[PDB]
Design a protein around this ligand. Structure first.
Ligand SMILES: CCCCCCCCCCCCC/C=C/[C@@H](O)[C@H](CO)NC(=O)CCCCCCCCCCCCCCC
Ligand SMILES: *[C@H]1C(=O)N(c2ccc(C(=O)NCc3ccc(Cl)cc3Cl)cc2)C(=O)[C@@H]1C
Ligand SMILES: *[C@H]1C(=O)N(c2ccc(C(=O)NCc3ccc(Cl)cc3Cl)cc2)C(=O)[C@@H]1C
Ligand SMILES: CCCCCCCCCCCCCCCC
Ligand SMILES: CCCCCCCCCCCCCCCC
Ligand SMILES: CCCCCCCCCCCCCCCC
Ligand SMILES: CCCCCCCCCC
Ligand SMILES: CCCCCCCCCC
Ligand SMILES: CCCCCCCCCC
Ligand SMILES: CCCCCCCCCC
Ligand SMILES: CCCCCCCCCC
Ligand SMILES: CCCCCCCCCC
Ligand SMILES: CCCCCCCCCC
Ligand SMILES: CCCCCCCCCC
Ligand SMILES: CCCCCCCCCC
Ligand SMILES: CCCCCCCCCC
Ligand SMILES: CCCCCCCCCC
Ligand SMILES: [K+]
Ligand SMILES: [K+]
Ligand SMILES: [K+]
Ligand SMILES: [K+]
Ligand SMILES: [K+]
Lengths: 271, 282
């Protein structure tokens, strides 16, 4: 019973931290998106009135009619390339959602496909992460013999190892594919980085999709991006895990800072 | 970290890799078999609606028609409502909406119905994801632990009904797993589905579909609870928030045990291939 009370206090504090995090994020997102949302809000209503006046021969009541059936139409996209990419988007959980099942049977099969594919792909992702782990481990085990030379102690070397990991991982799984996407997809630099992060975190908004545009592309383009999806998902799993590990020590150092502070402040009211 | 096992591991993942490739290949061909027909059924009915007004309004440039379609669908990617009967739209980035969006990012569901457009929004979204996803992982771990300990006490109450009719061991563990999947499906999949059926006005299959697509954190965005311009019950979206929490915990557990079942199946297949190759044509 009492260990469950200690658990409830831990989970409660974590939950409230997450709520506060959402509150901060919400107010910040509003602060950035609303202003430029009006900048884009007037650009379409202007085109409305301006093309109703530039084409007076068109009925104003027939204007909204086309918008109805157009948004209804948003409600070939299904060649082997598209369905294969979609089968990738389900089992990786990267739910871009650009194309989705509309038939009832298609929805049922998508359910079964997800429930079986996500675990199997988890096994694959584990194997890839292990391969990368041993390949990077030999590199850090070779650079530790050239590091213990000019030095005295340790602990600093683990942090240098993590720094090397973050640097090479960022120049191989986020930077280089970003500049390639800049060129092939015609995206901007920040949009390329944005796409990399949103995809490799498995968030997958769908506002930026590599190989999804009406661009020529190469025979070895989308397959290479597939391979990048594999290794990048592994790398981002590791980096997210270790960011969580940093959060652990931060929580511990903050509760010990709180102890240090309350203990150094209680004796001041006494004096 | 060395030795010969790294070859033995490479054979494992490689075979799994080919399996997943095969798994994708099959998955690709079947989806096409269902979605492609109704895609052309609507693809030719709209090009008719195009041409029928392409001839009924020759006063239109028609080359500027699809041009207008360009800017309208591009603005729909930002979620526009260009109407005159309802010449007053609501903001997609108020506190209520932006809170839900910040929820969709840290859970990785990422519905994507509304997305950042400003430069700062994208940069902040990157930082926000990189810090939020692990923290929410801790929260999900705590909720999964709470559900696990409540289920442990629940099965600890029925253990007096086990030490009686045929005393076994593992066969009772499988019943435990059965109880887990059944009750979890009737509380985190079935009940919210019928609620979505009622409030959101979705169909039964669409409700189950939404539940599954969200609790797996896929999140296509074609179905969003509380995402329509409907009144709702003010105490609806918070309840769906709590459902998001407990459902993600439950689905993590269910996916993990599906993987374990796949493991046992894979071992039984590696033994079946041996039995067959050794028995060669009986
Ligand atoms: C950039 C983000 C920074 C976020 C990090 C700031 C810290 C906030 C997160 C703290 C969450 C608790 C973490 C672990 C808690 C205990 O399991 C831990 C076991 O190892 N025990 C203690 O620390 C020894 C003391 C035990 C503390 C119990 C948990 C805290 C409860 C304190 C308040 C009690 C009321 C709770 C209701 C809100
Ligand atoms: C139909 C459609 O969906 N695509 C299309 C086809 C192929 C890709 C693709 O493979 N992108 C690289 C890739 C691979 C796997 C994953 Cl999990 C993600 C990604 Cl980004 C993208 C889009 C089309 O060209 C039409 C629109
Ligand atoms: C603006 C917008 O984004 N929403 C909106 C507001 C709130 C919700 C919501 O909370 N749905 C339940 C929920 C909670 C958390 C998560 Cl991670 C997922 C879900 Cl489904 C949805 C949509 C609006 O009504 C306008 C369009
Ligand atoms: C041995 C690993 C090297 C890491 C780079 C290999 C490819 C990973 C992504 C780079 C290419 C992705 C963009 C697609 C270019 C055709
Ligand atoms: C080194 C392990 C290789 C995997 C052995 C074959 C596994 C194939 C059976 C499980 C794969 C998913 C099948 C789902 C329907 C039975
Ligand atoms: C829905 C996909 C079902 C696919 C079921 C069969 C695919 C995997 C079978 C591979 C069998 C390999 C035997 C391993 C021999 C060592
Ligand atoms: C372990 C289940 C929760 C125990 C405490 C219940 C009331 C606390 C929330 C108000
Ligand atoms: C997903 C379709 C893109 C074209 C081929 C990409 C790789 C095919 C085999 C992995
Ligand atoms: C009518 C809904 C049918 C859902 C079928 C689910 C099958 C799960 C197999 C793992
Ligand atoms: C990753 C989600 C599916 C978990 C089952 C796969 C087991 C190996 C991954 C840890
Ligand atoms: C981002 C602000 C979080 C503050 C942490 C409060 C918890 C204190 C632990 C004793
Ligand atoms: C406050 C929790 C729900 C967040 C969605 C915003 C709408 C609040 C009233 C339903
Ligand atoms: C406001 C645009 C200037 C460049 C982005 C600055 C904001 C970064 C997140 C606070
Ligand atoms: C080009 C700007 C890239 C955004 C900076 C990302 C920093 C991540 C810190 C967590
Ligand atoms: C994943 C569990 C799905 C529950 C089956 C739904 C059956 C509804 C019949 C009324
Ligand atoms: C819902 C479980 C599917 C596997 C993804 C888990 C998190 C992925 C990015 C952290
Ligand atoms: C340690 C390897 C266990 C067997 C490989 C994983 C099987 C994946 C599901 C078919
Ligand atoms: K998604
Ligand atoms: K999406
Ligand atoms: K979308
Ligand atoms: K996800
Ligand atoms: K997703």
């Amino acid at each position: 019973s009492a260990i469950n009370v200690m658990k409830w206090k831990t989970v409660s504090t974590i939950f409230l931290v997450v709520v506060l995090y959402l509150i901060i994020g919400a107010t910040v997102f509003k602060a950035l998106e609303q202003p430029q949302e009006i900048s884009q809000r007037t650009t379409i209503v202007i085109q409305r009135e301006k093309f109703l006046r530039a084409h007076p021969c068109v009925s104003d009541q027939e204007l909204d009619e086309l918008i109805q059936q157009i948004v209804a139409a948003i409600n070939s996209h299904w060649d082997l390339g598209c369905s294969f990419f979609f089968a990738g988007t389900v089992i990786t959980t990267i739910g871009f959602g650009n194309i989705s099942p509309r038939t009832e049977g298609g929805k049922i099969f998508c359910i079964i496909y997800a429930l079986l594919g996500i675990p199997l792909f988890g096994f694959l992702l584990a194997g890839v992460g292990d391969q990368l782990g041993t390949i990077f481990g030999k590199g850090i085990a070779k650079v530790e013999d050239t590091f213990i030379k000019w030095n005295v102690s340790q602990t600093k070397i683990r942090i240098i190892s993590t720094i090397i990991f973050i640097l090479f991982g960022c120049v191989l799984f986020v930077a280089l594919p970003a500049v390639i996407f800049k060129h092939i997809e015609g995206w901007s630099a920040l949009d390329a980085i944005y796409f990399v992060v949103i995809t490799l975190t498995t968030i997958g908004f769908g506002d930026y999709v590599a190989g999804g545009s009406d661009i020529e592309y190469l025979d070895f383009y989308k397959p290479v991006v597939w391979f990048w999806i594999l290794v990048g998902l592994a790398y981002f799993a590791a980096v997210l895990s270790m960011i969580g590990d940093w959060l652990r020590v931060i929580a511990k150092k903050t509760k010990e800072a709180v102890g240090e502070f309350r203990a150094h402040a209680a004796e001041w009211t006494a004096n």
